[PDB]
Design a protein around this ligand. Structure first.
Ligand SMILES: Nc1nc2c(ncn2[C@@H]2O[C@H](COP(=O)(O)OP(=O)(O)OP(=O)(O)O)[C@@H](O)[C@H]2O)c(=O)[nH]1
Ligand SMILES: Nc1nc2c(ncn2[C@@H]2O[C@H](COP(=O)(O)OP(=O)(O)OP(=O)(O)O)[C@@H](O)[C@H]2O)c(=O)[nH]1
Ligand SMILES: Nc1nc2c(ncn2[C@@H]2O[C@H](COP(=O)(O)OP(=O)(O)O)[C@@H](O)[C@H]2O)c(=O)[nH]1
Ligand SMILES: [Mg+2]
Ligand SMILES: [Mg+2]
Lengths: 51, 431, 116, 34, 54, 436, 430
């Protein structure tokens, strides 16, 4: 029963998570956000402040 | 110094704003270059000391093909270059695309620009947001716009003008999916939301203005006249003023009741304007007529629960009171029992202006009515019907689930306004 | 860090009078009077001494970005006046559900007023 | 027209009446009128 | 400021025209170069008619 | 800003798209030598969708030509507009597939794709914001149906979140050009259902009767047939590169006619088709466009929707045109024919309007209709596949090239499960939930 | 009598002093010949012939960048012995530029500094221009500071450093030179502003509408910052500032001496025609993360101290009204122990424009120098890049072969490990 199978696969699913992207200029200039340096990533590293 | 920030999101919002800002430039005497050939323009234009005037509006969209006409058209010098925000790829008639994926990289730049206009303002009355329910950007990105604007600004007025989906004719297939899920965001993050639909304005232009085939050019002019009639009390001197905060309070009695209907009268061709007189009584019964509604719903099934009247031109307060006393004695017009004084009036002196190429005529006086009814409950029983009828077999849901939202939001958005439908009858039942 | 009132020209230096329409940082209305000198509590480089209590908040700040805010943002105007005892409970539970947004540097702070 | 039987047991969010008996009397009068 | 902006637009136009002229010159030199034209008179002994370049 | 990468497979692909690169060159005002010679100013506003800039103010197409034989490579270049393609985009093998899908997929086409993927990755990565890929091929051949479907399986894994279009030429029940036509058709539709966003079904016998009965041509050569499909390919992408009042690109169409990921087979059509003797006897206003567009004579697939059920319908208009008659005619055709449309989807028609008409014409329209009656095509192929597979007929060309006997079994089983899926959506119940 | 000697070391220093001294001559009306067609006494020295000589020292280890100064338009301007050129470049090596090559010419450059400083009746301080990624800009700069601190006791010294960008760069071994310069600079410097090439690339593309910038376009924007910093040293104003002044109000602890620069407005002539700019609208763009010319968002950190430099037709009250608006914004945050974190400087002369430039004529401008806790992520990322290479001994045979010992790498990483521990505990509320 393709109706039931399609509805079951729909309900038993997880939404994908989009990659964070930001645009700066008035024209769309898509850049990635994580490696750009505007989000704190390397602060939360393990060896921060310790030899 | 009573200034309003206009937000034009979507293709519909931009194309409305082209006719709306064309009307404002002629109303205050501004050439398309942005200069002069009084300070009533100060609520919309900012005086650059060189003599230029810049509108306090932003044009935001997700595709370049609608705003590149503005950058090259005859108003290419009036607008600020950085107030026309342009994306790369559109939401493509999707809510999840315009909410979770594509709406988030531009919400930084839009709130950056809105902050700059808010800094320029010395007295702020509210934000006017123009969008359409059936679109992708108007569905998705506007939901983030109201949600973020509530975070940044606490209690500022958010007046909204929406293109409601027409009952029988529409230009999309997943349009009911887009329109269920925008109510849930806009119930708590919006202050007031007028609705119009394209089908009812088609019937008005066909029967009244003796024109057979309108386009989007001469429907946007009618919408621009309504927005001008609301704001004209802020701009011009009047015998009784109305602010944006007034009919916000006067049309919303309950937190879920913020859906008033906008109608305009008179709207006639230049051939019939020679032949008909236009008194205050003759224009105040046209807006009450169900055939002249700009929303495809009959208010005779419902009952008027608040009203607001805005008058322009040569109008006398004595004939206003005689007209309202006449319309209160009609048994066809029905009010609720808990609202004995259900009217609010406003009077302005300056008559409406005419634009070249327009379809309307030069009329000394006109009225604009904002009426809140109970007859929207049939307009949501139909719209819940066609959302349900295609949600039963779970159609088009793989397009929404795959962009970043789970399946549970569809049951939440349907359940929330199903309880609201029980709420409308609960208010509507008399004591 | 801390704003201090001029106590007669404070009306001239408020937020909306200076054209800032967002919600405000608080102003110190009253001033406490000390007595004697003050004990010193930090190192030469700025480290706190081992004996002084330390707050457990983030030392960098509580700013919350675009991709970190909750997906269902609670509203800033909340009145439970004419609602049912279940609907108002659902709204205040929805308010309570995310403590991160309330205490953030941006910080949408709802004012729950009234009774159902 | 038609709605799901799944979305038919949801209540009403507002109250806007003093007591429940007055609400029931008003609903009975409305049913008699219609 | 308006006059200065007009001058800047003029400079940009002249830069574009210079770029196109340089492209045409490069195409002409490549279309006349020995490596692409395969000229058989490159391989000739300069002072001897009978001998050829190895 | 929204680039479309064109790729062509087979003799059918290289002779259809060669006409396609001539009709949009005339639309944008490009002479055969490459430079721009036109009058309007918005013709260069969106030209990067299909063209790459070159020196001297000339333009080259963003297309690659793929074949396994140099026979039509020498002929497309020697054509009228054959000097506009970049000579590095021509890729071709020295031994033909010979109308064999196994050679095109496993033996001869398995080495050429190492060279094709380098060229198409070079052309796609230069684009700042890619819209998607567009492929023209025929399922009745060896090098188009065999290697062209391997390109699809490779590109979809490399670029997942893009748009894939296939203007596939399905076999016809009456032309009977090749004996092994059902073998190549069955093994390729099985691959086309899993990794393709949009598919258009062009049939040759549905192009023959239009040129005979509607267009009234004495000699309908292949130049006239390929003008019809190139007009549809130009009309589906007209809101992408030209301004209008209500725009709709490929992604906005794909989200509206595809309600389930296995339901992506469409039906093209072109409305203004008249002859010289009757071009003065009728006007071509909006009622006349929508009267001919929905007509089963005009449709480009050789199976009648009158025996089927319309799932979703699209219509893209061209030229400066009123909005009220467009919406009136679309509402009228839904309301009168209340039995040919589905009931679990309201307002089945999606409408777009562009402002720039095709050249030589003032007003035009195109049709994209997702119908249940497309299952007539697959059952007709299946009954010819299962008739000649009982006898091990023509198998020694396939099973002698590393192919087992179980690929044919699974190719017809999933294709039989495909027509069972289309059937239940047609006969789905009214106003009722399920066990889900 | 007040004056400043500028020193430009490295190819980055020479190419940034070429545009800086071009602006100075147009500002004071000095011909490229060196004669007029008394405020120039801070940057030029009078000859009995009337010729003006700049008080700048150009240092490099190669002749391929000094020779354009020796051939081009300003050939007759600079002193012939102020352009000091070595024999072989350091070639992206800290050890080459600090130990084996820079030792030969450090005696020559210190002789020249002493000859320029002999004319100092009253000297304010030195301005230094160098980059962290190069051999001479990092290796030679380190022992130049080491010997200048011994030679001159408490003279103020200022660094205009070019920080390596988080995403693009021009070298592979560049984090080795960055850490081996910072470890020496923490103890032998007074103040050190940074600027990032990637961030000015974004500023020039977004605001100035230049799609393809070049280093010659970047040097004008940095040169405007130097002019506005030393503007009140030359011109009158309502509130004067000095090099001793904005040193004290930006360094709370001697370990933290790392402010970030910001300039506003930076717009073209087309955009300046549309938008009018009062001082409220130019001071609201300094705190904007889209206008910061260091690739870091200050909103994730806390402001330690600020300094505002105003030029042109500027009013003292309208400055005060705009700062109180900034003080009551929730987004702008300060640490709890700086209740008064600002400083203003008022000047009358509007900024000048050079021919062939990109900026436009504007009545007023502002320059911002801010100490921010949100720079700790720049050190943390630069820590990881140095950490990730040095675990597998990459490019370490080049450094140890010149003469430095292996233990300098472990000691430098140990030094900034305590520096990262410093940026937290400073920003912890009591
Ligand atoms: N009244 C009026 N409505 C318009 C106009 N233009 C578009 N619309 C409405 O917009 C709806 C379609 O959505 P659009 O606004 O065109 O597109 P969008 O909101 O930008 O979302 P996308 O399609 O994803 O780009 C139609 O149903 C129309 O009702 C207009 O000029 N006037
Ligand atoms: N901002 C800016 N930086 C520059 C400029 N020119 C060079 N640089 C910087 O200089 C760095 C590389 O150093 P070099 O150009 O080789 O000059 P150097 O510091 O003397 O190094 P060596 O030539 O090896 O001695 C690059 O990373 C750039 O960031 C410039 O004009 N502006
Ligand atoms: N519509 C159309 N069909 C064509 C054209 N050229 C060939 N065909 C059809 O393609 C069939 C042969 O396909 P074939 O050339 O073997 O495909 P290939 O092996 O992939 O190159 C013939 O029966 C033709 O009907 C064309 O230009 N247009
Ligand atoms: Mg949109
Ligand atoms: Mg060097």
């Amino acid at each position: 029963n393709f109706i039931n199978t399609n509805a079951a696969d729909i309900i038993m699913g997880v939404a994908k998570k989009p990659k964070p992207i930001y645009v700066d200029k008035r024209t769309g200039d898509k850049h990635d956000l994580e490696p750009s340096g505007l989000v704190p990533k390397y602060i939360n590293k393990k060896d921060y402040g310790v030899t | 110094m009573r200034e309003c920030i206009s937000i034009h999101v979507g293709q519909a919002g931009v194309q409305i704003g082209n006719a709306c800002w064309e009307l404002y430039c002629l109303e205050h005497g501004i050439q398309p270059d942005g200069q002069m050939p009084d300070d009533s323009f100060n609520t919309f234009f900012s005086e650059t000391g060189a003599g230029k005037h810049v509108p306090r509006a932003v044009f935001v969209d997700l595709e370049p093909t609608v705003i590149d006409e503005v950058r090259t058209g005859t108003y290419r010098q009036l607008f600020h270059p950085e107030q026309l925000i342009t994306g790369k790829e559109d939401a493509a008639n999707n809510y999840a695309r315009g909410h979770y994926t594509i709406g988030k990289e531009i919400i930084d730049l839009v709130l950056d620009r809105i902050r700059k206009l808010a800094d320029q303002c010395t007295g702020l009355q509210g934000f006017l947001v123009f969008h359409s329910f059936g679109g992708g950007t108007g569905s998705g990105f506007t939901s983030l716009l109201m949600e973020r604007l509530s975070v940044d600004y606490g209690k500022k007025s958010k007046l909204e003008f929406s293109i409601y989906p027409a009952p029988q004719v529409s230009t999309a297939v997943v349009e009911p999916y887009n329109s269920i899920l925008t109510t849930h965001t806009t119930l708590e993050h919006s202050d007031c939301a007028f609705m119009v639909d394209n089908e009812a304005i088609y019937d008005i232009c066909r029967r009244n203005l003796d024109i057979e085939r309108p386009t989007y050019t001469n429907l946007n002019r009618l919408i621009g006249q309504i927005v001008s009639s609301i704001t004209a009390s802020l701009r011009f001197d009047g015998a009784l003023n109305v602010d944006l905060t007034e009919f916000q309070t006067n049309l919303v009695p309950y937190p879920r009741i913020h859906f008033p209907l906008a109608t305009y009268a008179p709207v006639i061709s230049a051939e019939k304007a020679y032949h008909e007189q236009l008194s205050v009584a003759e224009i105040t019964n046209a807006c009450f007529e169900p055939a002249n509604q700009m929303v495809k719903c009959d208010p005779r099934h419902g009952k008027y629960m608040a009203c607001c009247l805005l008058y322009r031109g040569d109008v006398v307060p004595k004939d206003v009171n005689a007209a309202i006393a006449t319309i209160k004695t009609k048994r066809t017009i029905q009010f609720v029992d808990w609202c004995p004084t259900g009217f609010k009036v406003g009077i302005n002196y300056q008559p409406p202006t005419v634009v070249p190429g327009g379809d309307l005529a030069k009329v000394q006086r006109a009225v604009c009515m904002l009426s809140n009814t109970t007859a929207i409950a049939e307009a949501w029983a139909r719209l819940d019907h066609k959302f349900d009828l295609m949600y039963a077999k779970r159609a088009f849901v793989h397009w929404y689930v795959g962009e970043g939202m789970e399946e549970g939001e569809f049951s939440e958005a349907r359940e929330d306004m199903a309880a609201l439908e029980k709420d409308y009858e609960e208010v509507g039942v008399d004591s | 860090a801390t704003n201090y009132s001029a106590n007669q020209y404070e009306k001239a230096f408020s937020s909306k009078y200076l054209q800032n329409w967002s919600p405000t940082k608080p102003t110190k209305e009253s001033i406490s009077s000390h007595e004697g000198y003050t004990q010193i509590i930090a190192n030469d480089r700025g480290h706190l001494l081992p004996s002084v209590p330390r707050s457990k908040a983030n030392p960098w700040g509580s700013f919350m970005g675009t991709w970190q805010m909750p997906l269902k943002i609670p509203p800033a105007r909340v009145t439970l006046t004419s609602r049912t005892t279940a609907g108002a409970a659902s709204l205040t539970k929805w308010i309570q559900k995310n403590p991160d947004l309330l205490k953030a540097s941006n910080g949408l702070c709802p004012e729950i007023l009234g009774k159902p | 027209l038609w709605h799901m039987p799944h979305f038919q047991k949801v209540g009403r969010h507002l109250d806007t009446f003093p007591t429940e008996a007055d609400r029931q009397r008003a609903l009975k009068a409305h049913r008699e009128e219609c | 400021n308006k006059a200065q902006a007009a001058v800047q637009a003029g400079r940009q136009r002249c830069e574009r025209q210079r770029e196109q002229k340089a492209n045409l010159a490069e195409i002409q030199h490549q279309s006349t170069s020995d490596l692409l034209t395969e000229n058989p008179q490159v391989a000739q002994h300069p002072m001897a008619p009978y001998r050829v370049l190895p | 800003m929204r680039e479309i990468v064109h790729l062509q497979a087979g003799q059918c692909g290289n002779q259809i798209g060669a006409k396609f690169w001539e009709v949009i060159s005339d639309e944008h005002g490009i002479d055969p030598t490459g430079t721009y010679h036109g009058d309007s100013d918005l013709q260069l506003e969106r030209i990067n969708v299909y063209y790459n800039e070159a020196t001297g103010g000339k333009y080259v197409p963003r297309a690659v030509l793929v074949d396994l034989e140099p026979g039509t490579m020498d002929s497309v270049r020697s054509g009228p507009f054959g000097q506009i393609f970049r000579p590095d985009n021509f890729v071709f093998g020295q031994s033909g597939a010979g109308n064999n899908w196994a050679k095109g997929h496993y033996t001869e086409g398995a080495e050429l794709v190492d060279s094709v993927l380098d060229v198409v990755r070079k052309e796609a990565e230069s684009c700042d914001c890619l819209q998607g890929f567009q492929l023209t091929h025929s399922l009745g051949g060896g090098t188009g149906s065999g290697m062209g479907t391997l390109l699809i399986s490779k590109i979809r894994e490399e670029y997942p979140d893009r748009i894939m279009n296939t203007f596939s030429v399905v076999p016809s029940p009456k032309v009977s050009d090749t004996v092994v036509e059902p073998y190549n058709a069955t093994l390729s539709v099985h691959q086309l259902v899993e990794n393709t966003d949009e598919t258009y079904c062009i049939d040759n016998e549905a192009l023959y009767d239009i040129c005979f009965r509607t267009l009234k041509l004495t000699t309908p050569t292949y130049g006239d047939l390929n003008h019809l499909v190139s007009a549809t390919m130009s009309g589906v992408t007209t809101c992408l590169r030209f301004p209008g009042q209500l725009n709709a690109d490929l992604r906005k169409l794909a989200v509206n006619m595809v309600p389930f990921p296995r339901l992506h087979f469409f039906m093209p059509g072109f409305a203004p088709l008249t002859s010289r003797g009757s071009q003065q006897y009728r006007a071509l206003t909006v009622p006349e466009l929508t009267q001919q567009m929905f007509d089963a004579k005009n449709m480009m697939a050789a199976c009648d929707p009158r025996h089927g059920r319309y799932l979703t319908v699209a219509a893209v208009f061209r030229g400066r045109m009123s909005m009220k008659e467009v919406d009136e005619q679309m509402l009228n055709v839904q309301n009168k024919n209340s039995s040919y449309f589905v009931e679990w989807i309201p307002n089945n028609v999606k409408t777009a309007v562009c402002d720039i008409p095709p050249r030589g014409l003032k007003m035009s329209a195109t049709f994209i209709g997702n119908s249940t009656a497309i299952q007539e095509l697959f059952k007709r192929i299946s009954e010819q596949f299962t008739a000649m597979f009982r006898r091990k007929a023509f198998l020694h060309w396939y099973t002698g090239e590393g192919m087992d006997e179980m690929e044919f079994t699974e190719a017809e089983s999933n294709m039989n499960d495909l027509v069972s899926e289309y059937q239940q959506y047609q006969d789905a119940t009214a106003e009722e939930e399920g066990e889900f």
